[PDB]
Design an enzyme around this catalytic site. Structure first.
Site, PDB file in Angstrom:
ATOM      1  N   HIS A  97      -9.931   7.396   3.464  1.00  0.00           N
ATOM      2  CA  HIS A  97      -9.840   6.009   3.893  1.00  0.00           C
ATOM      3  C   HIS A  97     -11.227   5.407   4.159  1.00  0.00           C
ATOM      4  O   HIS A  97     -11.328   4.252   4.598  1.00  0.00           O
ATOM      5  CB  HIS A  97      -8.994   5.829   5.163  1.00  0.00           C
ATOM      6  N   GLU A 111      -6.377   6.202  -2.304  1.00  0.00           N
ATOM      7  CA  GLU A 111      -6.397   5.191  -1.254  1.00  0.00           C
ATOM      8  C   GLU A 111      -6.815   3.816  -1.769  1.00  0.00           C
ATOM      9  O   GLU A 111      -6.175   2.835  -1.421  1.00  0.00           O
ATOM     10  CB  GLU A 111      -7.358   5.612  -0.133  1.00  0.00           C
ATOM     11  N   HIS A 135       0.833  -1.215   0.000  1.00  0.00           N
ATOM     12  CA  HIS A 135       0.000   0.000   0.000  1.00  0.00           C
ATOM     13  C   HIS A 135       0.860   1.255   0.000  1.00  0.00           C
ATOM     14  O   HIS A 135       0.625   2.198  -0.765  1.00  0.00           O
ATOM     15  CB  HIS A 135      -0.901  -0.064   1.237  1.00  0.00           C
ATOM     16  N   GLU A 136       1.866   1.293   0.875  1.00  0.00           N
ATOM     17  CA  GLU A 136       2.709   2.490   0.899  1.00  0.00           C
ATOM     18  C   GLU A 136       3.514   2.652  -0.390  1.00  0.00           C
ATOM     19  O   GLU A 136       3.563   3.791  -0.897  1.00  0.00           O
ATOM     20  CB  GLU A 136       3.623   2.450   2.118  1.00  0.00           C
ATOM     21  N   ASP A 190     -10.489  13.159   7.845  1.00  0.00           N
ATOM     22  CA  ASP A 190      -9.735  12.210   7.018  1.00  0.00           C
ATOM     23  C   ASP A 190      -9.578  12.709   5.594  1.00  0.00           C
ATOM     24  O   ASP A 190      -9.724  11.962   4.622  1.00  0.00           O
ATOM     25  CB  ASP A 190     -10.439  10.863   7.054  1.00  0.00           C
ATOM     26  N   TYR A 238      -4.793  14.195  -2.730  1.00  0.00           N
ATOM     27  CA  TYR A 238      -5.107  13.374  -1.550  1.00  0.00           C
ATOM     28  C   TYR A 238      -6.240  14.006  -0.753  1.00  0.00           C
ATOM     29  O   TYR A 238      -6.106  14.260   0.439  1.00  0.00           O
ATOM     30  CB  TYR A 238      -3.887  13.156  -0.663  1.00  0.00           C
ATOM     31  N   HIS A 250       1.553   4.256  -3.026  1.00  0.00           N
ATOM     32  CA  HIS A 250       1.340   5.704  -2.988  1.00  0.00           C
ATOM     33  C   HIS A 250       2.427   6.397  -3.817  1.00  0.00           C
ATOM     34  O   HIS A 250       2.158   7.385  -4.477  1.00  0.00           O
ATOM     35  CB  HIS A 250       1.351   6.232  -1.560  1.00  0.00           C
TER      36      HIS A 250
HETATM   37  C1  LIG Z   1      -5.388   3.915  11.528  1.00  0.00           C
HETATM   38  C2  LIG Z   1      -4.535   4.154  10.237  1.00  0.00           C
HETATM   39  C3  LIG Z   1      -3.469   3.013  10.102  1.00  0.00           C
HETATM   40  C4  LIG Z   1      -5.473   4.146   9.015  1.00  0.00           C
HETATM   41  C5  LIG Z   1      -5.101   5.123   7.860  1.00  0.00           C
HETATM   42  N1  LIG Z   1      -3.792   4.712   7.371  1.00  0.00           N
HETATM   43  C6  LIG Z   1      -3.626   3.799   6.402  1.00  0.00           C
HETATM   44  O1  LIG Z   1      -4.596   3.146   6.005  1.00  0.00           O
HETATM   45  C7  LIG Z   1      -2.248   3.576   5.821  1.00  0.00           C
HETATM   46  C8  LIG Z   1      -1.541   2.473   6.679  1.00  0.00           C
HETATM   47  C9  LIG Z   1      -2.157   1.087   6.453  1.00  0.00           C
HETATM   48  C10 LIG Z   1      -2.628   0.386   7.572  1.00  0.00           C
HETATM   49  C11 LIG Z   1      -3.192  -0.883   7.385  1.00  0.00           C
HETATM   50  C12 LIG Z   1      -3.275  -1.422   6.095  1.00  0.00           C
HETATM   51  C13 LIG Z   1      -2.771  -0.727   5.005  1.00  0.00           C
HETATM   52  C14 LIG Z   1      -2.247   0.547   5.173  1.00  0.00           C
HETATM   53  N2  LIG Z   1      -1.425   4.790   5.898  1.00  0.00           N
HETATM   54  P1  LIG Z   1      -1.472   5.903   4.675  1.00  0.00           P
HETATM   55  O2  LIG Z   1      -0.292   5.788   3.767  1.00  0.00           O
HETATM   56  O3  LIG Z   1      -2.771   5.798   3.942  1.00  0.00           O
HETATM   57  C15 LIG Z   1      -1.340   7.460   5.611  1.00  0.00           C
HETATM   58  N3  LIG Z   1      -1.299   8.592   4.731  1.00  0.00           N
HETATM   59  C16 LIG Z   1      -0.883   9.770   5.221  1.00  0.00           C
HETATM   60  O4  LIG Z   1      -0.272   9.816   6.291  1.00  0.00           O
HETATM   61  O5  LIG Z   1      -1.154  10.794   4.419  1.00  0.00           O
HETATM   62  C17 LIG Z   1      -0.770  12.102   4.908  1.00  0.00           C
HETATM   63  C18 LIG Z   1       0.568  12.493   4.260  1.00  0.00           C
HETATM   64  C19 LIG Z   1       1.765  12.208   4.927  1.00  0.00           C
HETATM   65  C20 LIG Z   1       2.981  12.669   4.409  1.00  0.00           C
HETATM   66  C21 LIG Z   1       3.008  13.350   3.192  1.00  0.00           C
HETATM   67  C22 LIG Z   1       1.812  13.649   2.524  1.00  0.00           C
HETATM   68  C23 LIG Z   1       0.596  13.215   3.061  1.00  0.00           C
HETATM   69  C24 LIG Z   1      -5.134   6.584   8.220  1.00  0.00           C
HETATM   70  O6  LIG Z   1      -4.063   7.251   8.132  1.00  0.00           O
HETATM   71  O7  LIG Z   1      -6.215   7.134   8.591  1.00  0.00           O
HETATM   72 ZN   LIG Z   2      -2.813   5.121   2.074  1.00  0.00          ZN
END
Ligand SMILES: CC(C)C[C@H](NC(=O)[C@H](Cc1ccccc1)NP(=O)(O)CNC(=O)OCc1ccccc1)C(=O)O
Ligand SMILES: [Zn+2]
Ligand SMILES: [Ca+2]
Ligand SMILES: [Ca+2]
Ligand SMILES: [Ca+2]
Ligand SMILES: [Ca+2]
EC number: 3.4.24.27
Length: 316
Positions: free
Chosen positions: A231, A166, A142-143, A226, A157, A146
């Site tokens: 998400h 997402e 997933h990461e 969010d 985003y 991105h």
């Molecule tokens: C509770 C949290 C893990 C859920 C959610 N995050 C997620 O679902 C996943 C992690 C994941 C967990 C389990 C399975 C697959 C992926 N993290 P994500 O990559 O979507 C967080 N995105 C994120 O942090 O975007 C903000 C951003 C950061 C830095 C630069 C620009 C923008 C969220 O951030 O709300």
């Molecule tokens: Zn993500």
């Protein structure tokens, strides 16, 4: 770092043994030279400055508890690299073998993982909601996805484009999970989520509503939390992807499944040839219909199934 390629051995987050590609130069570093211009894994040492230090180990054996999140970040980046190269002929996230960098042990008790514009970053979890998040191959893919998105469609985003962003990461995280073929499923994050609770997950593609996310456009979230529900509203597109692959009847609309490989070809083409930073769900439907048409022909079962799937989730 400059040095000679070696092979170390260690244990990941879930206690499984695996070999990892390392580099030797006084120390053994988590630097895999066998893929592209390298996979590099860093220690953030419970702080938030990034990337931290390139992971160094004295004996090329990675069986310490502290080592496990690094072992899996490094190994699952390699698996995800292999998926994109072997399945989509894509060389790393930028298509030109850019070095892939990951940091683990980010912050303290950190219940998330992310792509910061330049690298992947993984928390250790607080031990109750999550264990170290690099232990999930669907999380690592997933990461890295991105990064792929950011170098291709560029989906902004927030709001609908962010929910597609997402979903693309959940879809390819799941396709990479199947590619590695270890306990694959259409669930998201189950390997590292809630260690005290078996059988659950953070999201579900097969039934997003099981964890409160919408499975129809009529149930879309439109407030501001969010980033406009990225998400949350991803469940509408995850469900469509599940239906395209697996088939099913959803709110009375029947979809003929065409299988994971063809889902992956269709969405990879959509992401790289038709989606733009501002695409909304209706434009994703069009992009997927055109991608399927390109690949399989306008009168194919694949095109008809894509239409059925987006009708089933209320997207025209
Ligand atoms: C509770 C949290 C893990 C859920 C959610 N995050 C997620 O679902 C996943 C992690 C994941 C967990 C389990 C399975 C697959 C992926 N993290 P994500 O990559 O979507 C967080 N995105 C994120 O942090 O975007 C903000 C951003 C950061 C830095 C630069 C620009 C923008 C969220 O951030 O709300
Ligand atoms: Zn993500
Ligand atoms: Ca060691
Ligand atoms: Ca699984
Ligand atoms: Ca999964
Ligand atoms: Ca659990």
């Amino acid at each position: 770092i400059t040095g000679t390629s070696t092979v170390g051995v260690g244990r990941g987050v879930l206690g499984d043994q695996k070999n990892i590609n390392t580099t030797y130069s006084t120390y053994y570093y988590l630097q895999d030279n066998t893929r592209g211009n390298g996979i590099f894994t860093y220690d953030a040492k419970y702080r938030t400055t990034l990337p931290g230090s390139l992971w160094a180990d004295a004996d090329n054996q990675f069986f310490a508890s502290y080592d496990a999140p690094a072992v899996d970040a490094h190994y699952y980046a390699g698996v995800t690299y292999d998926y994109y190269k072997n399945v989509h002929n894509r060389l790393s996230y930028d298509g030109n073998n850019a070095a892939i960098r990951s940091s683990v042990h980010y912050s303290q008790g950190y219940n998330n993982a992310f792509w910061n514009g330049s690298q992947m970053v993984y928390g250790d979890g607080d031990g109750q909601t999550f264990i170290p998040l690099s232990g999930g191959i669907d999380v690592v893919a997933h990461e890295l996805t991105h990064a792929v998105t950011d170098y291709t469609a560029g989906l902004i985003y927030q709001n609908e484009s962010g929910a597609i962003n997402e979903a693309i990461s959940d879809i390819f995280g799941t396709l990479v999970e199947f590619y590695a073929n270890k306990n694959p499923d259409w669930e998201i994050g189950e390997d590292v989520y809630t260690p005290g609770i078996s059988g659950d997950s953070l999201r579900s593609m097969s039934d997003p509503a099981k964890y409160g996310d919408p499975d129809h456009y009529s149930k879309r979230y439109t407030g501001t939390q969010d980033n406009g529900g990225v998400h949350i509203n991803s469940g509408i597109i995850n469900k469509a992807a599940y239906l395209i692959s697996q088939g099913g009847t959803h709110y009375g609309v029947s979809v003929v499944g065409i299988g994971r490989d063809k889902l992956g070809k269709i969405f990879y083409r959509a992401l790289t040839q038709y989606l733009t930073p501002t695409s909304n769900f209706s434009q994703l439907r069009a992009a997927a219909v055109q991608s399927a048409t390109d690949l399989y022909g306008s009168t194919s079962q694949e095109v008809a199934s894509v239409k059925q799937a987006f009708d089933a989730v209320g997207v025209k």
